[PDB]
Structure formats: structure tokens, C-alpha cells
């Protein structure tokens, strides 16, 4: 889709540079994209790839890296707290919130799988939404919750040619 072409554009931008170092905005955009796709190894390697002088010159790189450390340790509740600490540039204003949504979905998976019963406070910390998302669990999704115990209960959700190829390979 368009995401593939956008990634191709970033690959082109990274491929050639005046001296192997690109502009700080595109470096921050690449680091944010690496954080978005959960490709954290390339994210940290890009972070150490940045020269120390330009790294210390701008604090936006520091904030992006702090978000990267927060997501590296899988500290879900603190990801939203850290992502809101700083203000991002305008050209990446709407997409970074989208990244938050992505993390949202990630947390949802980590609750739907690997949790038969989850404490309401821990569930709210993982998803980030304080109390209202719990409602979305029962009314919309279809779970069954109960009060006075705060125990959320997640619920776990062309060939003939191939065979001819196999026989042709095996017979010869």
C-alpha cells in the first residue's frame, strides 16, 4: 500500500546523503517510524548511529530516545506518560498520536492473549485509558465483567498445478 511506498521513500532518503549524515528532522522521523513498527533493534542502532554532537544539540532526539527506552523495557503505562512529556513537530503531529493508537492495540493483544483474569487497575494501566475503556470491554466487545472484585475476564478470539509440479519434480 502507500505505507510501502513511504518506507521506500525513507529508504531513498537514507541511501544518499551529503556526508552520510542527514537532516535532524528526517533522522527523528526515521527513529519514530522504527519505534512505530516495533523494529527496536534498528531503532537503537540508529540512535547510536547519530553523532554525539548533533545528538546533544537537539532535545527532540532525546525525547524520541526516551520513548524508545520506555517501549524497549515494555513498560506499557509509562509509554503514554513519556509520549506526552514533549511536543512533537507539526509535520509529525497527527502521525505520532497514531503511533499511540498502535501501542493501544498492542496492549489490547497483550490482554486478550496471555491473560485469563486481569486486575482492572493493571488493565487500565496497560491500555492507558483510565476507567472508560473497561466499559468498552463489556458493552461493545462482549466480555462479562463483575463488580466488587475488579476482575476483568478477557475472552480469547491453483492447487492442481502445484501437485502437478510436485509429481513432475519427483518423476524426473
Amino acid at each position: 500500500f502507500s505505507f510501502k511506498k513511504l518506507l521506500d521513500q525513507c529508504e531513498n532518503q537514507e541511501l544518499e546523503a551529503p556526508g552520510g549524515i542527514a537532516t535532524p528532522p528526517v533522522y527523528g522521523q526515521l527513529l519514530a517510524l522504527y519505534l512505530l513498527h516495533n523494529d527496536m533493534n534498528n531503532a537503537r542502532y540508529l540512535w547510536k548511529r547519530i553523532p554525539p554532537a548533533i545528538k546533544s544539540a537537539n532535545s527532540e532526539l532525546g525525547g524520541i530516545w526516551s520513548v524508545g527506552q520506555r517501549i524497549w523495557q515494555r513498560d506499557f503505562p509509562g509509554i503514554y506518560t513519556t509520549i506526552n512529556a514533549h511536543q512533537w513537530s507539526e509535520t509529525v503531529q497527527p502521525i505520532m498520536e497514531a503511533l499511540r493508537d498502535a501501542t493501544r492495540r498492542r496492549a489490547f493483544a497483550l490482554v486478550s492473549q496471555a491473560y485469563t483474569s486481569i486486575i482492572a487497575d493493571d488493565f487500565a494501566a496497560f491500555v492507558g485509558l483510565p476507567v472508560e475503556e473497561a466499559v468498552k470491554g463489556i458493552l461493545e466487545q462482549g466480555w462479562q465483567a463483575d463488580s466488587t472484585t475488579r476482575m476483568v475476564l478477557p475472552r480469547k478470539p491453483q492447487q492442481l498445478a502445484r501437485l502437478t509440479d510436485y509429481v513432475a519434480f519427483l518423476e524426473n
Binding site: 501437485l163 502437478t164 513432475a168 518423476e171
Partner: protein, 105 residues
Amino acid sequence: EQFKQVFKELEFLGWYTTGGPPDPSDIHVHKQVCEIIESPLFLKLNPMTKHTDLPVSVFESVIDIINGEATMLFAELTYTLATEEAERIGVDHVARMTAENSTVA
């Protein structure tokens, strides 16, 4: 005389030839075969059939009543598909089995 001592209840019935339609050569050969038995059969096998008539066919000589030089006609007769259980099972087995043609083909 050689085969009569192996097949007791099997006597002469007719002659077979591979080819196209019944031609004057076929009737010429039948004119000699007919001196052995009263009505020899003819069994034509045509592997190159692309027409309405069946590739294999059975013919019988019919003495026409036309006056003068009466050339006997060759009338086609139908055949049945009678087969014993044992021989049918045998050909079924030989058809089930297979095998420079490709096996998948």
C-alpha cells in the same frame, strides 16, 4: 488341425482385417473365405475413425436377388457387450494399473 486339439468347442467363424471401409479387396477375400463355411463373419478395425460410424464393425455377406451378375452386399450387424464376471474383473484390474509418457499426464 493344430488348434482343434486345444480349443474343442471352437470352430471357424470368419475373418478379420484392419482398414477403412469395406472395399472390393475385402469382398474379393470374402469370396475365397466363403468356400469354407456357409456365412463367414467380417470384423473391421479402424484406428483412424473420425466419422459417425463406429471404429470397429462386423459385416456379413448377403446374397442379393438382383438379376444377372449379382454382386453380394456387405451388411453391417450390431454386436453386444456380453462379458463374464471373471474376464471383466481381469480387464478392470488391467485398467486400474498404470505404466515415455508422464505418470501425472
